[PDB]
């Protein structure tokens, strides 16, 4: 009471925030050691706990006598503070042994500072506002995982326990892979045997022993992290014939489809939120201030011109001389000459700083050393001259000159630092290359690029708050991991770099887990630390939450920002055009209004010059939806020989034969042996190539005897040369291989042959052109980071084969290697790491691999251990350098990738219509009207006799208790189906089998009862009942095969067990929100098959190229090209490409085939494998991903109107509900129905559409009367042609209410909008 008013003065809150920050620092200063060891500093820090606990208790005690209790405790943040202080007090007074779960509450102490800063609370509310629609998606995701886990429980259960054991001596498996006992699986090599029991591949953690292990491994497989290892284990345990059919869908449905759904839902939420009043009002302010500044610039230009004229006329006839000099200076820095000179100087500086490589000549080093001073002086003089000319305030007015000033002062600091201490370089003089961005000014894309930065800078508070909130949650999870696994990772040879001992190590581990790389390995290691696969699995829950709520939180931080700022920029740019042209025309109206004494020709000038700028009305679907949302929100606020060849080419039945020839040639390419070059099959393919190219040249001469043609010429002539050199010895085998590889352009000929495929290709090209500018900016930024990394790390990635030698002159001779418990002599050789930063190209490649996230911890370790220019690594020498990588990850993979996605989303052009002129009044109105236009009044087909028997069955089956019982049977069946496990007791298995028997019998009972309840053909009319029949017959077949004698050794018949697992889809009906979302996205996917064909063609072309080039690499194991992942066959090449597309070790596969590979024994060559892989793998990761990103958006936009519902006038989805309700009354079509039913029908349906409460029913009472009604015909007439029409016509775009007399005009407009429907609606319109 009295204490409240006199203590809530701000310094009290600031003192509490200081205490919280100090407590966070103390929690960060902790150190953990294994086996009970303790640092003295930890003992010193432990004494500070009572002070913090007392201060928190006092701060929470003063609030209780100022807000009461169960209102002080009304706030959730106060509840969290209270539980924190209560657990602290209990821990202080708790001497008992049970405090581990009580000491873990301290990790929530940082969150207290969220409650102390209300801005952080607002930002947290904003970020969590977008995770509510995603929850349903998560449910769907769960439905997927379970649905696959059950399948994984029926095929892979107890398969990873056999292993190659020597001869039963002490149970030491020679290898870490599952084997098979004399089967198409992996046979044991040597004299070992496939014995029973071996923990498993990953300490026995990734398996399908029961439903929990299956769920965990499926979830670990849908994050595209280590799924190929499980695929390979299943391959070598059961044969690789059918395993892909389980894992490719799991990746496709569980990863690509889920990500597409999440992406679409988030984009729809952002679009809906962007048009709220509180955000639109801020955007209008941001636009208004920019517009004011744009005018003020020109007005100061006016003022300065006038001032210099005044000064010139005054002087023409001390202060005057310097003022004239200042004006001349202020005019020599605003000319195009100065712009181009400074840009050329910047470009030369970039070129000279970009030539720095390792082992450069000394002369180049000295030249660059002097050029650095020369360029710094030139830039210093230019900055001083510009500042003197424009003036200090005017110079700092521009946001770009502030960056230049900061870069200049940082460069001076770096120069003096390096002069007083020769050594490392900060890397700030390279940042001057960002000034090269001023090349965009002379282009027509300056406004767009500049408005994005104006939008960004306008939101420094929100982005900082969001970036500090992401760090706050990364610090809370690091502390939790420190409490859980702190000092417990020494259960093996050495502690890993990914540990939780110190705070820097823990936070770096949490960051690495958030990036998703090797998180499953850390999960396995932590589980083993907590102890075995038996009693340590609960700790896995730490890594799931960190993976889930870290995977979509980042996507919620970085996408939203982009989806905001870019969108804002777009609007601003568009506005800056319309606010100009609409003014310019006005000028032409005044230029003619001012002159009446002479016939003005300027009136026609605007008329002929007004339509030149109205042709670029792109208006992507995002902009149209934004406009419609603005309209809805404002409305809601208001309411409150030549001839012969020509004939041959023009023949209608001629493109088809060319197409089939191309397809046959492509298949001939697919079926080839890269390694067994001396094969009869290869000779047959050579013959087919002869005939195939012969027909291609035959269709070329005649096509040219009367861009894409060049392509055809090169693919025809290329094969020609190969034939010319084929009829001789092995002349220029390099050219032979090149011309054979050039043959892969055969499918591309179809691009222009199929109009739809050409259209989708043009859509891809337009999407790339819409983002080329951001692509250029991204490349410039990545080049800057590459130069910085070259300065930081060049020359420091060398090592000696034994770690004792740190110099090259010492790395000579032999050394003792202690491996496999046998010391052996090994050569002592000085080598270099695979990925380094020796020059700018190597740095760019390394940073690209880091951006993909593959193997970036390895390069982080190599960068930390780097010591000097010619020294070997020293562990943990420079930990602070990891900042670099962290910053990199915050920029390119987090920010730039998300702005790429947002830019493609917000600029996606409509392709279905390609025009804005259909009716100009309907976007979803026509979609909702067509739903009632197409579907007839479907009925349930009630019995027409109802005598004694058929009626009884019909009533029983349609009884709601019956469907309740059947859903209960579904639930119990799916509980029993996941209840099996490994090495279960025999009676347990028998009980499970009997439960399956009785459940299948019950389902067959329902299936045969529905037949007599409805009828034979009436039952199979629905597409779902036939599915139930098929699955129940499959279950019957499987149970008969299991019970009665089974197929001894003939074709396998184990797939029938899938049938009983197909009943889960039977319970997917109850997800009314889930079902419609799934159906909508699937239907959108089935509407775009040609983009899928383009993706498949990309995969086909790359697979063929890889087969030809890398096909004959030796299959030696211990490398990335081995018995599991190779280019040997077309299917293997496709699997390798899919593995790279998801991204597992694509850089490792790239390294595994480069120009110096031991080559295959059966191969005819001695040197196989080229440096083409550098291009081959880098382009693919660019292309595939891009196409995928083009596919996802192409689906999302197709459902954008659904993803931006804001359901208050929902019409497309309520028609199905109305049909469901109406089907209860109408027995059949019957032509017309009676009068009394509709009065109750208006209430049977959902009240939201027609009458919300009793009062809106009056409006309904107005709809049935007061206007012309079909009552003119027979009294018993349908009104479904007049009720739902009326509701969907009056709910939005209502104009016949104010007048009520001009009905014929509206009817004519409606009819002419539906002119061709075969005149079926005429009866409905009445």
């Amino acid at each position: 009471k009295y204490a409240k008013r006199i203590t809530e003065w701000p310094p009290f809150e600031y003192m509490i925030l200081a205490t919280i920050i100090a407590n966070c620092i103390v929690l960060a200063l902790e150190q953990h050691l294994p086996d009970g060891d303790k640092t003295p500093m930890s003992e010193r820090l432990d004494d500070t706990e009572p002070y913090f606990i007392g201060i928190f208790c006092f701060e929470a005690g003063i609030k209780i006598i100022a807000l009461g209790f169960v209102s002080y405790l009304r706030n959730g943040w106060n509840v969290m503070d209270f539980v924190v202080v209560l657990t602290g007090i209990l821990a202080t007074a708790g001497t008992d042994f049970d405090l581990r779960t009580l000491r873990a509450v301290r990790v929530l102490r940082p969150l207290k500072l969220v409650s102390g800063i209300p801005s952080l609370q607002v930002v947290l509310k904003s970020i969590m506002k977008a995770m509510v629609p995603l929850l349903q998606i998560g449910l769907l995701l769960f439905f997927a995982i379970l649905m696959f886990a059950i399948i994984g429980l029926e095929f892979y259960m107890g398969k990873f326990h056999k292993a190659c054991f020597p001869n039963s001596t002490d149970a030491e498996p020679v290898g870490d892979f599952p084997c098979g006992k004399e089967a198409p699986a992996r046979l044991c090599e040597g004299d070992t045997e496939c014995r029973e029991y071996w923990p498993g591949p990953n300490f026995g953690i990734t398996n399908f022993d029961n439903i929990l292990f299956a769920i965990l491994t499926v979830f670990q497989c849908i994050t595209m992290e280590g799924w190929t290892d499980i695929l390979y284990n299943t391959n070598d345990a059961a044969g690789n014939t059918w395993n892909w059919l389980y894992f490719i869908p799991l990746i496709i449905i569980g990863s690509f489809f889920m990500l597409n759904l999440v992406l679409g839902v988030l984009s729809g939420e952002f679009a809906k939120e962007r048009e709220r009043v509180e955000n639109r009002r801020a955007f209008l302010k941001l636009r208004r201030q920019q517009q004011i500044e744009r005018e003020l610039n020109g007005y100061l230009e006016w003022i300065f011109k006038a001032e210099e004229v005044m000064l010139a006329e005054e002087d023409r006839n001390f202060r005057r001389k310097e003022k004239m000099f200042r004006f001349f200076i202020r005019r020599m820095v605003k000319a195009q000459s100065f712009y181009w000179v400074v840009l050329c100087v910047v470009a030369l500086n970039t070129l000279c700083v970009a030539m720095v490589h390792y082992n450069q000549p000394r002369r180049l080093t000295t030249t660059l050393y002097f050029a650095e001073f020369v360029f710094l002086g030139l830039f210093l003089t230019e900055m001083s001259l510009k500042m003197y000319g424009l003036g200090p305030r005017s110079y700092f007015r521009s946001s770009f000159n502030c960056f230049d000033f900061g870069v200049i002062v940082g460069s001076v600091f770096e120069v003096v630092w390096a002069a007083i201490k020769p050594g490392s370089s900060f890397g700030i003089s390279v940042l001057r290359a960002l000034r090269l961005l001023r090349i965009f000014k002379v282009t027509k894309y300056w406004s767009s690029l500049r408005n994005l930065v104006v939008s960004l800078l306008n939101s420094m508070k929100s982005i900082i708050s969001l970036l500090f909130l992401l760090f706050l949650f990364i610090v809370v999870f690091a502390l939790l991991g420190m409490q859980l696994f702190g000092g417990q990772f020494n259960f093996q040879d050495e502690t890993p770099t990914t540990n939780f001992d110190t705070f820097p190590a823990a936070i770096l581990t949490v960051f690495q887990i958030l990036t998703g790389e090797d998180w499953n390995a850390v999960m396995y290691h932590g589980i083993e630390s907590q102890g075995g696969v038996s009693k340590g699995m609960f700790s896995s829950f730490y890594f799931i939450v960190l993976t889930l709520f870290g995977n979509y939180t980042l996507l919620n931080v970085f996408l939203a920002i982009a989806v905001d700022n870019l969108a804002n920029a777009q609007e601003l740019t568009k506005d800056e055009e319309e606010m100009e042209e609409a003014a310019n025309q006005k000028l032409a109206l005044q230029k003619a209004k001012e002159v009446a004494e002479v016939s003005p020709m300027s009136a026609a000038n605007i008329s002929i010059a007004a339509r030149q700028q109205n042709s670029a009305k792109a208006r992507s679907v995002w902009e149209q939806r934004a406009s419609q949302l603005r309209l809805q929100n404002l409305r809601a606020s208001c309411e409150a020989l030549r001839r012969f060849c020509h004939y041959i080419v023009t023949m209608r039945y001629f493109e088809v034969v060319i197409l089939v020839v191309i397809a046959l040639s492509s298949i001939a390419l697919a079926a080839e042996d890269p390694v067994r070059t001396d094969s009869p099959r290869n000779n047959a393919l050579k013959y087919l190539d002869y005939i195939f190219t012969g027909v291609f040249t035959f269709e070329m001469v005649i096509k040219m005897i009367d861009l894409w043609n060049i392509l055809d010429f090169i693919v025809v002539s290329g094969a020609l040369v190969a034939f010319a050199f084929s009829g001789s010895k092995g002349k220029d085998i390099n050219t032979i291989k090149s011309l054979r590889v050039l043959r892969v352009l055969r499918p591309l000929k179809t691009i222009k042959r199929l109009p739809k495929l050409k259209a989708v290709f043009d859509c891809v090209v337009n999407s790339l052109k819409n983002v080329l500018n951001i692509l250029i900016v991204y490349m410039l930024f990545m080049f800057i980071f590459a130069v910085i990394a070259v300065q930081l790390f060049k020359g420091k990635f060398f090592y000696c084969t034994d770690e004792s030698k740190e110099l090259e002159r010492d790395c000579r001779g032999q050394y003792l290697d202690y491996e496999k418990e046998e010391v052996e002599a090994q050569p002592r050789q000085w080598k270099k790491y695979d990925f380094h930063y020796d020059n700018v190209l190597w740095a760019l490649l390394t940073l690209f691999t880091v951006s993909t996230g593959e193997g970036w911890p390895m390069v982080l370790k190599h960068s930390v251990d780097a010591t000097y220019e010619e020294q070997g690594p020293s562990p943990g020498y420079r930990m602070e350098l990891s900042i670099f990588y962290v910053v990199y990850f915050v920029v390119f993979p987090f920010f730039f990738v998300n702005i790429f996605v947002a830019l493609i989303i917000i600029t996606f052009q409509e392709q279905g219509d390609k025009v804005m002129s259909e009716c100009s009044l309907e976007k979803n109105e026509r979609a909702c009207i067509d739903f009632a236009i197409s579907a007839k009044p479907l009925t349930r087909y009630m019995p027409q006799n109802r005598q004694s028997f058929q009626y009884k069955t019909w009533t029983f089956v349609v009884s709601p208790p019956f469907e309740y019982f059947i859903m209960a049977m579904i639930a119990l069946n799916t509980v029993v189906l996941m209840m099996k496990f490994y090495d279960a007791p025999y009676e347990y298995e028998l009980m499970l089998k009997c439960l399956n028997i009785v459940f299948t019998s019950m389902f067959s009972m329902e299936c045969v009862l529905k037949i007599i309840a409805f009828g034979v053909l009436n039952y199979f009319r629905d597409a779902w009942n036939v599915f139930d029949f098929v699955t129940v017959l499959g279950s019957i077949t499987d149970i008969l095969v299991t019970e009665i004698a089974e197929t001894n050794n003939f074709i396998n018949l184990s797939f029938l067990r899938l049938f009983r697992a197909a009943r889960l889809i039977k319970l997917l009906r109850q997800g009314y929100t889930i079902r419609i979302l799934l159906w909508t996205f699937v239907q959108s996917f089935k509407a775009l098959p040609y983009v899928c064909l383009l993706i498949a063609m990309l995969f086909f072309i790359y697979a063929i190229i890889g087969m030809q080039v890398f096909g004959n690499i030796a299959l030696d194991d211990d490398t990335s090209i081995n018995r599991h992942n190779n280019f040997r066959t077309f299917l293997q090449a496709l699997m390798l490409l899919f593995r790279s597309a998801t991204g597992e070790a694509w850089h490792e596969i790239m390294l595994s085939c480069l120009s110096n590979q031991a080559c295959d024994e059966q191969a005819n060559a001695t040197e196989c494998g080229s440096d083409f892989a550098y291009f081959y793998f880098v382009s693919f990761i660019f292309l595939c991903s891009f196409l995928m990103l083009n596919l996802f958006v192409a689906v999302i936009m197709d459902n954008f109107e659904y993803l931006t519902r804001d359901s208050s006038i929902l019409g497309p989805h309520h028609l199905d509900e109305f049909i469901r309700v109406w089907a209860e009354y109408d027995p059949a079509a019957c032509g017309r129905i009676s009068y009394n039913d509709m009065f109750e029908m208006l209430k049977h349906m959902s009240p939201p559409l027609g009458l919300g409460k009793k009062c809106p029913a009056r409006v309904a009472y107005k709809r049935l009367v007061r206007m012309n009604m079909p009552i003119s015909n027979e009294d018993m007439t349908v009104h479904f042609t007049s009720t739902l029409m009326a509701l969907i016509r009056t709910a939005l775009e209502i104009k016949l209410a104010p007048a009520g007399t001009k009905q014929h005009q509206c009817d004519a407009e409606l009819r002419k909008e539906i002119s061709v429907v075969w005149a079926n609606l005429p009866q409905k319109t009445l």
């Binding site: 290898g175 870490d176 892979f177 591949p201 290892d229 093996q492 040879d493 050495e494 890993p496 770099t497 990914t498 090797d518 390995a521 850390v522 290691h525 090592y799 084969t801 770690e803 290697d817 491996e819 496999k820 090994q826 080598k831 790491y833 695979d834 193997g855 911890p857 390895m858 370790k861 211990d1118 490398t1119 990335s1120 070790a1145 490792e1148 390294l1151 595994s1152």
Partner: peptide, 25 residues
Amino acid sequence: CKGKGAKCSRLMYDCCTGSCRSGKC
């Protein structure tokens, strides 16, 4: 770092070349 074919731990990142697959560099 560990040479080709040597026994390794995935979470050590101490293979000279390649990754630590199936417990071997």
